[PDB]
Motif scaffolding. Sequence first.
Motif, mmCIF file in Angstrom:
data_model
loop_
_atom_site.group_PDB
_atom_site.id
_atom_site.type_symbol
_atom_site.label_atom_id
_atom_site.label_comp_id
_atom_site.label_asym_id
_atom_site.label_seq_id
_atom_site.Cartn_x
_atom_site.Cartn_y
_atom_site.Cartn_z
ATOM 1 N N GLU A 1 60.429 43.027 0.019
ATOM 2 C CA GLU A 1 60.130 42.720 1.421
ATOM 3 C C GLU A 1 61.342 42.913 2.333
ATOM 4 O O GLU A 1 62.414 42.348 2.090
ATOM 5 C CB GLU A 1 59.568 41.299 1.557
ATOM 6 N N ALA A 2 61.149 43.725 3.373
ATOM 7 C CA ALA A 2 62.182 44.034 4.366
ATOM 8 C C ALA A 2 61.835 43.448 5.741
ATOM 9 O O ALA A 2 60.716 42.966 5.953
ATOM 10 C CB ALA A 2 62.392 45.541 4.455
ATOM 11 N N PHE A 3 62.801 43.490 6.662
ATOM 12 C CA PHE A 3 62.640 42.946 8.015
ATOM 13 C C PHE A 3 61.749 43.819 8.898
ATOM 14 O O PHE A 3 61.932 45.039 8.972
ATOM 15 C CB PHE A 3 64.006 42.725 8.679
ATOM 16 N N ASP B 1 60.167 40.054 13.462
ATOM 17 C CA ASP B 1 61.392 39.304 13.166
ATOM 18 C C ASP B 1 62.458 39.491 14.251
ATOM 19 O O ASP B 1 63.157 38.537 14.605
ATOM 20 C CB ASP B 1 61.950 39.700 11.792
ATOM 21 N N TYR B 2 62.570 40.718 14.765
ATOM 22 C CA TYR B 2 63.496 41.050 15.855
ATOM 23 C C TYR B 2 63.051 40.479 17.205
ATOM 24 O O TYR B 2 63.892 40.155 18.050
ATOM 25 C CB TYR B 2 63.690 42.566 15.963
ATOM 26 N N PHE C 1 61.283 37.630 17.374
ATOM 27 C CA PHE C 1 61.542 36.200 17.161
ATOM 28 C C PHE C 1 63.001 35.810 17.428
ATOM 29 O O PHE C 1 63.262 34.739 17.984
ATOM 30 C CB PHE C 1 61.108 35.774 15.747
ATOM 31 N N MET C 2 63.932 36.679 17.028
ATOM 32 C CA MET C 2 65.367 36.474 17.267
ATOM 33 C C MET C 2 65.734 36.500 18.751
ATOM 34 O O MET C 2 66.609 35.747 19.187
ATOM 35 C CB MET C 2 66.201 37.496 16.490
ATOM 36 N N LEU D 1 64.556 33.235 20.046
ATOM 37 C CA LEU D 1 65.496 32.204 19.595
ATOM 38 C C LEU D 1 66.790 32.218 20.413
ATOM 39 O O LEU D 1 67.398 31.165 20.633
ATOM 40 C CB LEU D 1 65.810 32.374 18.104
ATOM 41 N N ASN D 2 67.201 33.414 20.843
ATOM 42 C CA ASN D 2 68.342 33.595 21.744
ATOM 43 C C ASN D 2 68.105 32.967 23.121
ATOM 44 O O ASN D 2 69.023 32.386 23.708
ATOM 45 C CB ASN D 2 68.683 35.083 21.896
#
Lengths: 236, 235
Positions: A2-4, A8-9, A11-12, A15-16
Amino acid sequence: AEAFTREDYVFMAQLNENAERYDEMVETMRKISGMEGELSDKERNLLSVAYKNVIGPRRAAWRIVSSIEAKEKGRQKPNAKRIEQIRVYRQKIEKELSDICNDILKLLQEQFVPRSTNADAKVFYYKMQGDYYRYLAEYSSGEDKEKIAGSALNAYNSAFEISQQLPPTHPIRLGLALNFSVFYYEILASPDRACELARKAFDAAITDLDKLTEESYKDSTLIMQLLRDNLNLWVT
Amino acid sequence: AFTREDYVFMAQLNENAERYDEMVETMRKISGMEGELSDKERNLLSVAYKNVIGPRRAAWRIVSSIEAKEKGRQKPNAKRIEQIRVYRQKIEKELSDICNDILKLLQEQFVPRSTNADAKVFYYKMQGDYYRYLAEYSSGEDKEKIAGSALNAYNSAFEISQQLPPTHPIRLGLALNFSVFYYEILASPDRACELARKAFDAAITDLDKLTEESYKDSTLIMQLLRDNLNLWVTD
């Protein structure tokens, strides 16, 4: 195994925004900018939020620094060393303000605009192109100011033409209508076109105010429409 | 040639422009100059470092709240927790470096050159404060070692602080931060309540000094209300 993935990007970047660390948010969005495909309505919103919260604190800082420089120049006995102390400091901010705009407008011309296919996506990029060209003209002077504002007007006019297809009550169309009217008044020195375009957009918004409002309050909408209809009948 | 007056206005201008990363760099340059830091200079040093550690501290507690929510979900995402962990450690790396900058400077330059009793309390308070921010995320025996240096710094401050008047901003500022250190770090609520009350009761006794002549009648009632509450709480 499993890779990113793309989610996911995204979500980051969210989160920032939650951590209020916008310097890292620009770096995260650039990774998604390097990726191929058209950004979602959520993703384009994140790109708008990321860059506005970096240029925002520095534009607010510039209006404080320049006022101190105006204070020392207006003094009875001005200190040239203290004036130079503010002047070099102001130019350091002006170097940074140009760098953020240099980052986004390079990405807009090379990545976002040539890849865009949607009608409302096109308006969003050209509005953003016009906005960050406008910020460069806020401190530039002479021939530099005219050359920057010349490419700014071309971006705004390209945005306005496509936005005619969009509904009058769209947030992107109204957001463009505000930013175009500010551009005429604050940069281009044209109050006649500024008052004309802002009024015509406002009149279109009142006409379709019924679409914004619930069916319970549509009677109060019509009275507000009729009140606006009277004010347009007057002052011929 | 650039002098101290030039750098002080630059440090003031950094505060006015709200650019605090540059403020730390200018304050380090004044720290390299001859002599000990003045009262106005020490005040700028406190403002400079607080507004750098502050955004890092504020972001930490929000991220921790997200991390606690993600770990306790019905459908937990382990890939997201790993994304948060690396991001948390990156903030923790930065939180370490800000504290490593100030406490190395305090131990080697600020405290050994200190001659004033007034300045002495201010440096040891700053010693105690930035050791406290390290223990806020540190775990296990590593937390025990950092808090050990924090207790020594706070206790050294308290002894010289007794020479100062009870209504002093540095004495009260230490008493607030020492009481937080007991409750939040050491987990001693009964000693946190002891020291905070001792400082508060002494402040009301000397509250007549702070208050104007026009409002001295209100001060005596505030003293009497404090005297009544201190006696009514027992039995």
